Design a protein around this ligand. Sequence first.
Ligand SMILES: N=C(CC(=O)NCc1ccccc1)NO
Lengths: 237, 300
Amino acid sequence: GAMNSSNYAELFNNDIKLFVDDTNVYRVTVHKTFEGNVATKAINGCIFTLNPKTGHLFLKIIHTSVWAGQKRLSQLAKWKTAEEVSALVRSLPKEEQPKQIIVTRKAMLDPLEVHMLDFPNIAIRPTELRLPFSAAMSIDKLSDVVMKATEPQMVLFNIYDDWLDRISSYTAFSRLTLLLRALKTNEESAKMILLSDPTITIKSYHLWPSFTDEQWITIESQMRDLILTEYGRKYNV
Amino acid sequence: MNTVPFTSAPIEVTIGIDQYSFNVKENQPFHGIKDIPIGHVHVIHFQHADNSSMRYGYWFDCRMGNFYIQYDPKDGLYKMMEERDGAKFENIVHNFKERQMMVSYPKIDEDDTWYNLTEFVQMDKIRKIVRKDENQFSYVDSSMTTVQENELSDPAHSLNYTVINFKSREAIRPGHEMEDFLDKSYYLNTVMLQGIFKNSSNYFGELQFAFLNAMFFGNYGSSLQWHAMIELICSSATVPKHMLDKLDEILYYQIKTLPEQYSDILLNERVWNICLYSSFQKNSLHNTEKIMENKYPELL
Ligand SMILES: N=C(CC(=O)NCc1ccccc1)NO
């Protein structure tokens, strides 16, 4: 059924699964028109489809042209997300197709279920976890490829860089969600923490800096402080 | 006017005939029901006094044969049977009519309720849903499950209603996923009305047959079927004008006839609120919306 704290280790077993986050699919700026009314301008978005065991991120870029002349865009965005995830599954060899797809927002359940009727054996699941995948566009290299796209495009990333050479996928996912939770709670501070030290660089083929194991413990500690720090500034505690 | 004689009444039972009902005491000299209107299907139904578990009954059409009821002390129920000897039956009915041991189907002349509840319900069409071909009448009870219920166990004793499933390849054209899920017109008009049923007359009859089994027997799978057939129409943006107008009439008489105290169980809040207030047809069911709002405003 629904994925939660109780069944959290299932993410890192050997049954292929994907998380699908649709938060960043339909993105707009709201602005005033010359007549003093309000209008939206779409900007490029992305589906965030992640294998939590391997770190493989299938980033489908949603170009603003897909919205042209369409109505009810927030509703369409869920169905476009489901269409694109279904197309991705069909593009994968059978032995790479997921056995479960976990959607981060429950409004994705029926759109994805309907698009996946041809795959009755792929379980479509919600989650009670509040995952911070919306903050994916705060990763500079992902934001850059989305905003630069001039057409629909799929870009493949490993969101864990090379971490799995040294840590398990449970620990890698925990680091990722901590980093993303931090970027979501205070982006400027989070990026200051990540980049405050000029000597630690991001490899061309990576998303995050090349921290040593000891520097990661420091970094992780600073991110937890920030999340508590902001939790106080927000609640006056 | 036709007659369903009863050989006897050995156990105390509440007997229903269509929307009417009466109590028969153990070994009371009851020998059946006379003056049954010709031209309609009818249902004769039973609830034993000593065990209200299992309401059961028989759908029949007196034009199709001479039917009588006799209690079976082995199987413990009132059974319908067909008398083939027309002279034994005509003599039996006359003798009992002369001794005034029959109740009269008590139809008020002004009253079109039964017609309005059974306008599209035929026995041969009813026989597609309840399969037992050696009999001209059809047995139904509270516990019988539907074919769709069995998919999600004894197939001979199932209600073979038309399987409707909104998240099914039958309901959803490849490449029209969002369109077909949000507007069910192709499923209603092409798949169901043109391909499975042939005409709306047939669609309404199953909807009516599903309601009546839900109401008279408390058959849960029938209730599911009734609501699914309503929801399929209401969730279609393109429905013929005559179907909507007839649907409104059908539902009006169903809601009118429903016992007030069974509304909590026989009416699905989500379906009705969706159909009356959110769906494409939310403004097309004036009579039904008015009786629902004045009779069951809680449900909404
Ligand atoms: N489509 C069917 C079922 C059917 O013939 N339903 C119509 C109907 C009408 C009145 C009473 C009961 C059933 N079989 O293929």
